[PDB]
Design a protein around this ligand. Structure first.
Ligand SMILES: Cc1cc(C)cc(-c2ccc([C@@H](C)C(=O)O)cc2F)c1
Ligand SMILES: Cc1cc(C)cc(-c2ccc([C@@H](C)C(=O)O)cc2F)c1
Lengths: 116, 116, 116, 116
């Protein structure tokens, strides 16, 4: 599991459950090619997006569908979605966790990049 | 000044100076049209991006060029840029401040929306 | 104005108004002595806490009364308060801005330290 | 495991490993009584702090010894320590995770409160 996404809710103090997450890889012509997607679990995590063989160096975009998340909870949100855009680099560690902390008018994100 | 950007550096405990910012607006064909750009001052603030007349209703993307910022300080950061994507002015004209807090492997952003 | 506090609300996308702040300084006996207090204005800012003369070197604790803030808006938050504890002026006088971003179950804080 | 602490490093993009964490419970006379302590693991987590029988309702303080963390990595930090102060309430969920994201001049914290 070289790529994991973990989403938390700063209003409810809970995992962000059943959030849609789409990953894209930047193509040669600078367009965004669908790569992987899924919905966060009851723990706010999304595992199994890709495999070591599929996850090559390059620029990736993780889109988190925050607007749908907030409106399913009855909350008015600011953003259309959250975006995390980063380069995967085979130098240094090989497991990427993209973590996001959501509020209606704000979000935080960090990267946790490690070896097993 | 209906759109402003303010950026802080969480490593230095200082304004983030000379941060490039590019604003896009979603066009009729659903592409991202360049709208405005500038860079943060010595105070970490970017004023004068647009006008009340030109800042019409739409979906806007504020790209904050965090990689360029960190590389210019000699640091190899995680992200390519921070994105803030939102619908603006859909209940009439508002003033938006996009605030960001930067670290090499993490950033936060918030919006301050006021009615003049 | 060598110590200032600025607070934003990540649910409302607005300044956090009428936030009570209490500042303490560690005394010779290692207890927390009350130093100064105030509350955020309509802009989310708190000016006039102290003076250059009175703001001597020491360990300071800035308590931001987040529970009181959220309860006054009818919300039952997680935290009692946010604390920011730091040594001030140990390389000579500096100006400190303590910035905070509030959600009901989460907060962020940063320091902006400048040399006048 | 009713109380867990999880610490991440926003400069290195890693867990915050071998950080000292002290938990206190507020006594009747408003002093802070030592309650539990430990050091974060290789995953930035601290498990086994307390037991259901020991963790009663009341106000708790989680101190994270960030200053020692940063100076063991050769980094100049702002804060003396990070503080998280909250009420444990048997109404609603019974597992508390206190998560913290560290930068030299900033920190974020959230609460993830759940049932199994
Ligand atoms: C204080 C803070 C800030 C940010 C951007 C993420 C998180 C966070 C998000 C998801 C998670 C996942 C990995 C978890 O809860 O196990 C952990 C976190 F510390 C916490
Ligand atoms: C994204 C983020 C994170 C944190 C901890 C503070 C702030 C913040 C708080 C107050 C202000 C005030 C001083 C302002 O200039 O609007 C600015 C900020 F960027 C923004």
């Amino acid at each position: 599991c070289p790529l994991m996404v973990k989403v938390l809710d700063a209003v409810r103090g809970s995992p962000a459950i059943n959030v849609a997450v789409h990953v894209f890889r930047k193509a040669a012509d600078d367009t965004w090619e669908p790569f992987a997607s899924g919905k966060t679990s009851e723990s706010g995590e999304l595992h199994g997006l890709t495999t070591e063989e599929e996850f090559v160096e390059g620029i990736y975009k993780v889109e988190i569908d925050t607007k749908s998340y907030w409106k399913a909870l009855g909350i008015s949100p600011f953003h259309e979605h959250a975006e995390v855009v980063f380069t995967a680099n085979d130098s240094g560690p090989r497991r990427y966790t993209i973590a996001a902390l959501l509020s209606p008018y704000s979000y935080s994100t960090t990267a946790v990049v490690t070896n097993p």
